């Protein structure tokens, strides 16, 4: 009723994360998987439960894939399970803050709004995007008012990644740029690499990835630490040990070295084209606050690599323009930052926002859907 | 009970109290509306923007100038700008202070009376008077005769006066101003290769114009030099950082003012229309008008404009008739200085048109108590 | 011994001779070298994304292929005219004339403006022409066989932009064509299944309420996709540049302001004669929609709500099945007309002296 604490939920191809507001850490994080088979056939499970299942004959499937809902029935089953078993909450006496990708269509948006307002008899609902919340999660205090809003967010979801040049809380609809990499494709590539030489499938792949996969400013000028010191050949075990080799050194370079798996353009060039397509009087700020997000983005030296690449590209372009003109310009300053938020910045930003009282007003009321119907929200 | 003034020119509103040597609010007169819908909650996201805020966050907000060529077009935006000026910058309630206004000659009586009506019915001002943006420049200069040439961002007019007696039949007006110059500059830049089509890019082009643009005596000689050598190619940086170079365009732009045939208009230049206006008056006062002609308002701060105008008017007029231009450095605020002086004067008080007169006689009174 | 015609376009290129109604050859400018109709896999360039040229060497290769493979002539002196946007930077035409005068003679070219070319093609002497190509569009008025040169308008949204927006919409739906290939297939499906909405609200309500308007289109690989509101939406993204990300009034309002900027005594003669050119203008329902938009804009801006005299407007838009090659037909007609006198052209001579300045003889 706008007085209790609002619930923050975020579904995803890789991990669904749900919890409450006014918290420093999220709650109920788990990989977003469901498992099922007088007669009802209603025995099902989700999350780590479903993962541990399938030993007694329980099927498995991923509701959402490629960043777009596919089965509203299973999605509603999943929401019902997570809302009536994991969280003992009441959907009526609490407001809901849902997040959807910038590419979510109005059909799916209104389907979710209806299945939430009607079946769960909710009271207040607010659908938003991940870009603005991930950006808001960048600053630390959030009250000094010296924060910045103009930024260039890049979210690498476990299934798909994309980039948005936000400017003063005004999202862009054209300069948006997606890419199907930076997700389970890296895991599949590392698995295919491992299955070639060492037969001993994907669980260990993602484990060793999150454990040791890092980047390097170069590869061919690199590979030298490997040729010299065998110490890089770590030994990871699950059930026996496995030779890492060079997966930890090659996997993340898929971004800066595309067209290695199932073509695309490197990330620096992509973000440069995005910033150029955007208006001119906002690039000086867009290049300044470049925040990241998504687990697949929280690599070891991702920020330094991207910053160096984009800086050298912009410097080459400006030097071309200069030597063509003859004057001397002021070298634009590019910066990157990731302060213990790129992992789950979306939920942190959502909660920080919901903490405001204006959330209760910006939400949608049940009577609104009752009188207007399912055509309330159309597009951002 | 000190009076104030607010010159609402097509380029920027200059608002300030009276009895002062310089104004306080020098803020641009533009209204910006967000292109997108906006989703942030609790961080601005206002439905409109006005003043320096627009010029700052212009890369998203679509801009609009409410008044064009001196006539108002968007009364809602105009009253919004007036509210922002009175309640944010000046930080004063006009209910206890009069408000002197300004307007260009040969403007719609409907526009003037609507301005008066809105100012009287919305702000509850006690009195409200208007005047020309040229007699004020004359007062600021401190003279009592001569011809005055204003070239505001919206219009460009010239008016003679002798000992305080105006000559309406000699007044001249033209719609050429800085906006057409900026459009021609954008066109010639596209000719060069640089493209500028949006509103923020229009403001950037206007800034370039204010920064580096001059005039010369021999336009053909300057064109030949620019086409032969590169001593005129000047560099300029942009917020993106990619510097650019511009050649003869910097001085080819004002040739529109000096040769409207470039943009398409058929009327003559400022020199020819000034000569015609002077010729419309009597010779006994022409003799003096030629000796003291003042420039005011924007679009004339270009360097070298004095020499070109002097040569042109001298070639168009006899030689024995001496000619002297008056182009001080304090011209962009000359109209405001004149308004402040007139408001501070004593007799002018009796000319203030109050609330009861308008309430009992209607707006039509403004066409009699004023010029 | 007659001159040649070559209206080098954004993505397409059409060539013939000094007098030929229908173009003898037409092929995409997509790109040993594969320049030509061999596109039917090497690198894909698409040099002329807009009226500008980027890979001048690839353009030279394309012209060589066109003159040696599609055509069997390699002369030095045979006049050949050209086409270009109205305000195309001087550097582009300068480099073009330089390469065509150095690598070949081609004494006398006299590049011209697609607007006046199409006007010649239609055999007119007054009216406004709105060319809508693939990378750029322009608007040019004319009165009593005279050009204004100060109300000409340019607009850099057409073709490629609508294709990119359709790709983004199909991505929103789920189908992705991120590959460099399939661009031609998306172009084909656009030119095949697309039409402007005479009533946008009506079409939106229909698409939201009915299952009709949803079509199934096959692909060369074999799979099938479904198309919906995008069909009637892409002409809206053409009509509403703000949707694409550009800050411009559009097309109807653009031409309305362009005409209003002219003299009253000409305005009428412009509302009575309006021609189009370019494949992008062949969108179904575009002419009548534009006419209705112009009528509404007039009703709003001028009459402010007085429909008593609206019928006394007399607007007559023009359209034909040959707008796809109107520029070519006009270039051919002009070449046949000017093939007699060589003074109007720019011979291979008088080039080293002040060649670049000779190009200023056309546009003062």
């Amino acid at each position: 009723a706008s007085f209790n604490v609002p619930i923050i939920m975020d579904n995803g191809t890789g991990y669904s994360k749900l919890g409450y507001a006014g918290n420093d850490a999220p709650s109920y994080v788990f990989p977003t998987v469901i498992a099922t088979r007088a007669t009802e056939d209603l025995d099902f499970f989700i999350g780590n439960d479903a993962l541990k299942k399938a030993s007694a004959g329980y099927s498995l499937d991923y509701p959402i894939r490629h960043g777009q809902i596919e089965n509203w029935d299973h999605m509603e089953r999943f929401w019902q399970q997570s809302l009536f078993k994991y969280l003992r909450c009441e959907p009526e006496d609490h407001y809901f803050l849902l997040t959807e990708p910038p590419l979510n269509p109005p059909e799916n948006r209104e389907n979710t709004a209806e299945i939430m307002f009607e079946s769960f008899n909710c009271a207040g609902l607010y659908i938003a995007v991940q870009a603005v919340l991930a950006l808001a999660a960048s600053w630390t205090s959030s009250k000094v008012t010296d924060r910045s809003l103009t930024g260039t967010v890049v979210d690498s979801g476990d299934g798909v990644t994309h980039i948005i040049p936000v400017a003063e809380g005004y999202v862009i609809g054209s300069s948006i740029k997606t890419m199907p990499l930076a997700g389970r494709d890296v895991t599949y590539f590392v698995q295919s690499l491992l299955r070639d030489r060492n037969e001993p499938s994907l669980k260990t792949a993602e484990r060793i990835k999150e454990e040791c996969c890092y980047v390097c400013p170069d590869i061919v000028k690199e590979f030298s630490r490997f040729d010299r010191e065998p110490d890089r050949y770590l030994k990871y075990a699950s059930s026996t040990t496995i030779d890492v080799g060079f997966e930890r050194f090659l996997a993340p370079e898929i971004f800066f070295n595309p067209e290695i798996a199932s073509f695309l353009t490197p990330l620096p060039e992509l973000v440069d084209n995005v910033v150029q397509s955007s208006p001119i009087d906002v690039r000086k700020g867009l290049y300044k606050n470049i925040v990241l997000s998504g687990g697949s983005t929280l690599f070891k030296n991702f920020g330094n690599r991207l910053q160096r690449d984009l800086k050298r590209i912009v410097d080459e372009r400006i030097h071309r323009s200069e030597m063509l003109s003859g004057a001397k310009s002021g070298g634009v300053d590019v910066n990157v930052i990731s302060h213990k938020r790129q992992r789950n910045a979306v939920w942190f930003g959502g909660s920080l926002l919901a903490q405001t009282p204006e959330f209760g007003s910006y939400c949608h009321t049940k009577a609104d859907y009752e009188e207007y119907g399912a055509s309330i929200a159309r597009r951002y | 009970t000190t009076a104030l003034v607010c010159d609402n020119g097509s380029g920027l509103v200059k608002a300030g109290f009276a009895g002062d040597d310089a104004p306080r609010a020098v803020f641009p007169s533009i209204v910006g509306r967000p292109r997108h819908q906006g989703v942030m909650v609790g961080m601005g996201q206002k439905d409109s923007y006005v003043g320096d805020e627009a010029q700052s966050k212009r890369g998203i907000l679509t801009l609009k100038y409410p008044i064009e060529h001196g006539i108002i077009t968007n009364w809602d935006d105009m009253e919004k700008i007036w509210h922002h000026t009175f309640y944010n910058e000046l930080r004063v309630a006009p209910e206890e202070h009069p408000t002197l206004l300004t307007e260009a000659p040969l403007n719609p009586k409907a526009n003037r009376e609507k301005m008066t009506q809105i100012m009287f019915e919305t702000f509850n001002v006690p009195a409200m008077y208007v005047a020309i943006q040229a007699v004020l420049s004359l007062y600021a200069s401190g003279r009592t005769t001569g011809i005055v040439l204003d070239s505001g961002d919206g219009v460009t007019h010239n008016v003679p006066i002798y000992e305080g007696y105006a000559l309406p039949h000699a007044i001249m007006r033209l719609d050429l101003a800085g906006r057409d110059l900026t459009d021609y500059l954008m066109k010639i830049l596209t000719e060069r290769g640089y493209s500028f089509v949006t509103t923020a890019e229009r403001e950037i082009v206007r800034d370039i114009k204010e920064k580096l643009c001059y005039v010369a005596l021999d336009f053909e000689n300057e064109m030949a030099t620019a086409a032969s050598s590169s001593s005129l190619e000047k560099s300029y940086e942009l917020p993106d950082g990619q510097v650019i170079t511009i050649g003869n365009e910097r001085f080819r732009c004002p040739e529109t003012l000096f040769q409207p045939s470039f943009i398409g208009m058929e009327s003559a230049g400022i020199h020819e229309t000034t000569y015609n206006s002077i010729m419309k008056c009597d010779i006994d006062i022409r003799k003096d008008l030629y000796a003291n002609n003042v420039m005011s308002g924007g679009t004339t701060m270009y360097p070298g404009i004095a020499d070109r105008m002097q040569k042109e008017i001298t070639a168009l007029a006899p030689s024995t008739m001496k000619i002297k231009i008056i182009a001080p450095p304090e011209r962009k605020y000359s109209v405001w200085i004149g308004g402040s002086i007139l408001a501070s004067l004593s007799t002018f008080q009796q000319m203030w048109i109050t609330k009861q007169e308008y309430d009992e006689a209607g707006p039509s009174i403004v066409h009699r108590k004023c010029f | 011994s007659a001159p040649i015609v070559l209206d080098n376009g954004t993505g397409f290129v059409k060539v013939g001779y000094a007098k030929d109604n229908f173009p003898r050859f037409q092929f995409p400018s997509i790109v040993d070298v594969m320049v030509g109709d061999e596109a039917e896999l090497l690198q894909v360039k698409y040099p002329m994304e807009n009226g500008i040229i980027r890979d001048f060497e690839e353009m030279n290769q394309l012209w060589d292929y066109t003159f040696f493979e599609k055509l069997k002539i390699d002369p030095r002196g045979r006049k050949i005219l050209l086409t270009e946007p109205p305000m195309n930077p001087v550097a582009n035409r300068e480099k073009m004339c330089e390469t065509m005068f150095e690598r070949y003679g081609f004494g006398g070219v006299y590049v011209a403006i697609q607007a006046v070319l199409s006007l010649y093609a239609q055999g007119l002497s007054s009216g406004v022409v709105v060319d809508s190509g693939d990378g750029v569009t322009h608007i040019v008025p004319v009165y009593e066989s005279v050009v204004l040169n100060h109300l000409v308008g340019r607009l850099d949204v057409a073709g490629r932009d609508a294709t990119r927006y359709l790709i983004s919409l199909l991505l929103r739906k789920g189908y992705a064509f991120n590959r460099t290939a399939d661009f031609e297939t998306v172009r084909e499906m656009k030119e095949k299944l697309c039409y402007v909405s005479y009533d946008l609200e009506l079409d939106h309500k229909l698409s939201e309420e009915t299952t009709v308007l949803m079509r199934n289109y096959t692909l060369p690989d074999g799979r099938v996709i479904k198309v919906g509101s995008e069909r009637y939406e892409c002409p809206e993204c053409l009509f509403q540049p703000h949707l694409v990300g550009s800050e411009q009034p559009g097309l109807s309002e653009f031409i309305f302001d362009t005409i209003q900027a002219a003299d009253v005594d000409i305005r009428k003669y412009l509302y009575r004669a309006i021609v189009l050119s370019g494949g992008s203008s062949m969108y179904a329902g575009l002419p009548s929609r534009l006419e209705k938009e112009i009528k509404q804009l007039w009703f709003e801006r001028v009459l402010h709500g007085d429909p008593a005299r609206l019928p006394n407007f007399k607007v007559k838009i023009e359209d034909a099945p040959r707008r796809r090659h109107a520029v070519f037909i006009g270039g051919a007609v002009l070449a046949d007309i000017m093939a007699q006198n060589d003074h109007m052209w720019v011979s291979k001579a008088e080039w080293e002296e002040y060649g670049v300045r000779a190009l200023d003889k056309l546009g003062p």
Partner: peptide, 7 residues
């Protein structure tokens, strides 16, 4: 993009 500045 190919105008040496804007677009």
């Amino acid at each position: 993009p190919a105008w040496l500045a804007t677009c």
